[PDB]
From a paper:
We optimized crystals of l-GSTSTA for microfocal X-ray diffraction, starting from dense needle clusters and ending with single needles. X-ray diffraction from a single crystal of l-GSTSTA yielded a 91.7% complete data set to approximately 1.1 Å resolution, while data sets from three crystals of l-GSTSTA obtained by MicroED were merged to achieve a data set with an overall completeness of 86.4% at 0.9 Å resolution. Atomic structure solutions were determined for l-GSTSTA from both microfocal X-ray and MicroED data by direct methods (Sheldrick, 2008). During refinement, the number of atoms in the X-ray structure increased to 36 peptide atoms and one bound water. The modeled water molecule also appears to be well ordered, particularly in the structure of l-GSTSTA determined by MicroED, where it has a B factor of 3.28 Å2. The single coordinated water is hydrogen-bonded to Ser708, the C-terminus of a symmetry-related strand and the backbone of Thr709 in the mating sheet. Homochiral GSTSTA forms a class 8 zipper in which two in-register, antiparallel β-sheets meet, related by a 180° rotation normal to the protofibril growth axis. Side chains between neighboring sheets tightly interdigitate to create a close packing within the fibril; the inter-sheet distances range from 5 to 7 Å. The l-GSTSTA protofibril appears tightly restrained within the crystal structure, as shown by a mean B factor of 0.92 Å2.
Residue numbers in the entry: 707 to 712
Write the structure that this text describes.
């Protein structure tokens, strides 16, 4: 799983 924001 992965989650990234900007």
């Amino acid at each position: 799983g992965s989650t990234s924001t900007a």
